[PDB]
Amino acid sequence: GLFGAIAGFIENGWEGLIDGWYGFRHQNAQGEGTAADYKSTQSAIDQITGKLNRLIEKTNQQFELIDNEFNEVEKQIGNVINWTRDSITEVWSYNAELLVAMENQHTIDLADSEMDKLYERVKRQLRENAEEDGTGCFEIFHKCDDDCMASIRNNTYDHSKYREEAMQNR
Amino acid sequence: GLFGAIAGFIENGWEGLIDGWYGFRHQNAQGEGTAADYKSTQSAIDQITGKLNRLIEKTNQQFELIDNEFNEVEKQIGNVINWTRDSITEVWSYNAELLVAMENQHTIDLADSEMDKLYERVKRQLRENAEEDGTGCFEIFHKCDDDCMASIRNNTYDHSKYREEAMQNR
Amino acid sequence: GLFGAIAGFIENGWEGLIDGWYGFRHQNAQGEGTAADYKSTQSAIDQITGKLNRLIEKTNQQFELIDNEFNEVEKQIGNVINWTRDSITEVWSYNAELLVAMENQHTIDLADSEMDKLYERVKRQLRENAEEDGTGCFEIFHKCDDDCMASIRNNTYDHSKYREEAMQNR
Amino acid sequence: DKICLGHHAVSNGTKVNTLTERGVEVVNATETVERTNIPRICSKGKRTVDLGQCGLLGTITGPPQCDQFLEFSADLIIERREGSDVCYPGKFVNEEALRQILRESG
Amino acid sequence: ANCEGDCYHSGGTIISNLPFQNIDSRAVGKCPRYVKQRSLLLATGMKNVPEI
Ligand SMILES: *[C@@H]1O[C@H](CO)[C@@H](O)[C@H](O)[C@H]1NC(C)=O
């Protein structure tokens, strides 16, 4: 998309992540572990459902019947009615196609956005203690055990403690 | 927003900043200061008044009366006229609603954009002599007085003449 | 634009570049050399031509004649017809102008986007072996020749080989 | 040693269309164009008159088929193809106008 | 009488919250606008990027 995260520097997504939309998956001394991030998952779903609720809602304009099916109306006013109705149906078909298209473009470029926002939150969490791998992975220098990763998730990770070690491991 | 700066990693806004839209706030030995930035505020308001200038102007098409208010026209042609007019009204309501919606979305995402552009300019000025706070601030390892900050806000800051002092302060 | 790469921190473009859209321009010991990057070019190109494919095509819906150029129709029904056609013509003019304006905005911001995606790609190839210029250049620290550059532009660049030198030369 | 960021995906994608690409595959999409029809006239909370063989204009003149509707009262008036506005042949002048009147007559 | 609707046509009733329909252009009542397209799919999710 526009932010180059989805179908971008993150090569592909994880078909096993069912907890939510976006999450972390760490490899450390204590084994692999994958778990979602509620914050951004909800940040995207709330926006998509905003689109829906704004779109699927009815107008209160009621239309009456102006021509007849069983007893056809006069020819000139019938050709005018049909002409008008075809022009209107053309307008609405165009409005609908353009609408769906642009809401889909903005939806994809929105999820891409929320991903890049998460990665760029982890990045500012791990200030100098970790290096950008490039495939959306962060290479941690110090020893981050299965409880330290949780501090990375909860945004409770204090980098000052581990900065001494990871800095030197340059 | 899409870029994650406004109501993103920046917690909230500075209600007192009547000098402009965006700005710098510095905290050093000589105190605390708040100043604005004409470049980004202007590159934004130009764009917004660009939108206004594109929308706030009327069409030169003139319409005529085709029915009558005091002496109602024939029933059939009046019902056709009404059905057509109400259909037009529905179309223009829809186009208006979607116009305001999609122009507001792009307005806010535009403001987010300008903020993130500033916060990346200040970093590329402030090469490794400073590190990213996380709340949208820059932690500088060397000493910046008021003239130092005013040299950052003018894009006049040179990183080499403060390279050593701060790098050793890793 | 929205991404501040084209007409942003990258001062301007290169009229000399006729190979593709975005490219690299290096100045090392073995003289200056510049050549274009194909993946980004073909991305932006395939997207813009996607817009054209969606636009350049015509409806199969056929409209008949409801008035007469040689022998004017009855006056009232003719004024209703002209009123309807003027209202529709007005609608399609608005839809056209809005469509083109938004497709241009999005196009520009998309090329801006692809530029930022290339710059941020290389920035992650050269993990700690270079430093951010501020004008879209990458100040390398190790002695990269006209073959190590071609290993950048193929992404075959290994940063661990040349890490020691560039690190020490900090 | 490391930590990775990423998103989800499914093996059964749903294809949509965008400004810039035709048939881009996404996770879950929905429908905006209704085709689910109910093959009945749904009239909960409406006084309905199924005219049947009685034509709508015949409620004024009163041919035999329309005896049962001489003073009908409804919020929803349902016409049928088998309606016959007349018994002795003839036709109303400006008949569609009077039809449009009687349709919104209650 | 059990079913409840507010948009009719010669073939029945259009019960739907969707903004469009491809059933009958002449339908009357409080009705979604008629469009030519059989289906217009609105995305409610991100791009599907699976393992190759
Ligand atoms: C058409 O609408 C106007 C107001 O919108 C109303 O005064 C007039 O009576 C309507 N005509 C018919 C034939 O119902």
> Which residue, among B7, B26, B11, B5, has the nearest Cα to B114 in the 3D structure?
B5
DSSP states of D57-106: THHHH--GGGGGGTT---SEEE--TT-BS-SSS---TTHHHHHHHHHT--
- Within 8 A of C47 by CB-CB distance, chain D residues are 20-21
Give the closest-approach CA distance of A158 to chain E in angstroms: 32
Residues sharing a CB contact under 8 Å with residue C57, sequence separation 6 or more, in sequence order: none
Is C91 in contact with A91 (Cβ distance < 8 A)? yes
Residues sharing a CB contact under 8 Å with residue B77, sequence separation 6 or more, in sequence order: A77, C76, C77, C80
Query: Which residue range forms the structural domain that includes residue B134?
Result: 1-170
Residue C67: other Cβ atoms inside 10 A: 14
Is D22 in contact with C53 (Cβ distance < 8 A)? yes
CA dihedral D6, D10, D16, D17 (to 10 degrees): 40
Q: Which of C2, C84, C91 faces B113 most closely, judged by CB atoms? A: C2
Lookup result for tokens 């905003």:
A50
Q: Which of B73, B82, B86, B89 to mutate for ligand 1's pocket (most ligand atoms within 8 Å of CB)?
A: B82
Q: E38 CB near a chain A CB, below 8 Å?
A: no
The residue contributing the CA closest to ligand 1 atom 5 is B82
Distance CA A4, CA C134 (A): 21
Chain D residue whose CA is closest to C47: D20
Total number of residues shown for chain A: 170
Total number of residues shown for chain C: 170
Distance CA C147, CA A129 (A): 32
Residue B162 is given by DSSP the state G
Give the closest-approach CA distance of A75 to chain C in angstroms: 11
CATH number of the domain enclosing C145: 3.90.20.10
> Which residue, among C33, C34, C5, has the nearest Cα to C19 in the 3D structure?
C34
Is B79 in contact with D101 (Cβ distance < 8 A)? no
> Which residue, among C114, C146, C134, C125, has the nearest Cα to C23 in the 3D structure?
C114
- Within 8 A of B91 by CB-CB distance, chain A residues are 88, 91-92, 95
The residue contributing the CA closest to ligand 1 atom 9 is B72
Work out the end-to-end distance of chain E between its first and last CA atoms, rounded to an integer number of angstroms: 54
> Which residue, among A109, C120, C119, has the nearest Cα to B106 in the 3D structure?
A109
Q: Tokens standing for B64? A: 């005529």
Resolution as reported, in Å: 3.5
- Within 8 A of A21 by CB-CB distance, chain E residues are 46
Domain count for chain C, please give it. Answer: 1
Lookup result for tokens 């050709």:
A79
Experimental method: X-ray
Distance CA D70, CA D60 (A): 7
- Within 8 A of C86 by CB-CB distance, chain B residues are 61, 63
Lookup result for tokens 């020893």:
A143
Contacts made by residues B56-64, CB under 8 angstroms, sequence distance 24+: B59/C90, B61/C86, B61/C90, B63/C83, B63/C86, B63/C87, B64/C79, B64/C83
